[PDB]
Write a protein that binds this ligand. Sequence first.
Ligand code: UMM
Length: 166
Amino acid sequence: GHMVNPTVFFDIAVDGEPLGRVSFELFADKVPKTAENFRALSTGEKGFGYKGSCFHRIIPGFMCQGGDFTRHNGTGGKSIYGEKFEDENFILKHTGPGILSMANAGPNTNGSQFFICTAKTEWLDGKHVVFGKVKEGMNIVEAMERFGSRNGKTSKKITIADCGQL
Ligand SMILES: CC(C)[C@H](NC(=O)OC(C)(C)C)C(=O)N[C@H]1Cc2cccc(c2)OCCCCOC(=O)[C@@H]2CCCN(N2)C1=O
C-alpha cells in the first residue's frame, strides 16, 4: 500500500547508563534517498551503522551531532551508497527543535553524520538536507543536551546503545 514514512529509534546511554529512547519520523515521502540512508544505518542491515556510536558534539541551545561511527570524533562516517551522496533537495526547512538534518563538508557531501536541532536553525536552510523529525522522546534529547558545552565537548559519553526500526 501507500509508503508509510519509517519510524526509527535510538536508545541513548550516558556513561553506559540507560537514559531513554528517541524516535524519529523519516520523511521518505519527500527525501527518499536521504531517509533510506538513515533508516538502513539505524537497523544495521548492511553490516554497519549507528549502533554503538556516540554523539561527539553537543552545543546547548543549538544541536546534538552524531553519526560518525567510523572515527568517533566528527572526521569519519559513511553512507550506504559506497560514496558521499548528493543533497537530495532542500524542500524541508529547519523550523525548530527536533528537526533531523544532515551534516556535511560542502555541496553534495552527505555521509552518515547528522544533527538533531534543539533550537530553530533557519540559517542552515538550503545548506543541510532536512530529512526527519523527533516523534517521541524530545525530552531525552533535552536531557542529552545538558551534557554538552559551548565548544561542543560532552561532559559524559553519550552513546547510541541500541537502534532500529519500529
Ligand atoms: C560532517 C563532517 C564531515 C564535517 N566536516 C567538515 O566540514 O570538515 C572540514 C571543515 C571540511 C575539514 C562537519 O563538521 N560539518 C559541519 C559543518 C558546520 C555547519 C555549521 C556550523 C559549523 C560547521 O561550525 C560552527 C558551529 C559549529 C558547531 O556546529 C557544528 O560543528 C555543526 C552542526 C551542524 C552539523 N555540522 N557541524 C556540520 O555539518
